[PDB]
């Protein structure tokens, strides 16, 4: 898969953080959205 075993630790580290960051952005947007106009 043309990576080394260490750059699957590294990449993974970066990935986890970035995705969790996006998810942060999303949960933020939806709580605000719930605030202005709840859908459930």
């Amino acid at each position: 898969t043309g990576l080394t075993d260490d750059e699957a630790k590294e990449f993974h580290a970066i990935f986890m953080q970035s995705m969790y960051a996006w998810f942060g952005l999303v949960v933020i947007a939806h709580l605000l959205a719930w605030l202005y106009r709840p859908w459930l």
Binding site: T1, G2, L3, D5, E7, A8, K9, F11, H12, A13, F15, R37, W39
Partner: protein, 60 residues
């Protein structure tokens, strides 16, 4: 157990470049899709005329 513990190894299996770009597309399209879903339902936020209507804002 709720914990993965060896899931860095997934990139020993799946091309990271491809996985990345794949997610980019899937997210940008899904964004477009659901945006369009909300724009077509009761929860719409553009054609509301809230808090003041612009399409009947003039006498002229």
């Amino acid at each position: 157990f709720t914990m993965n513990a060896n899931l860095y190894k997934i990139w020993l299996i799946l091309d990271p470049r491809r996985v990345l770009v794949s997610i980019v597309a899937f997210q940008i399209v899904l964004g477009l899709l659901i945006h369009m879903i909300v724009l077509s339902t009761d929860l719409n936020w553009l054609d509301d005329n809230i808090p003041v209507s612009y399409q009947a804002l003039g006498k002229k």
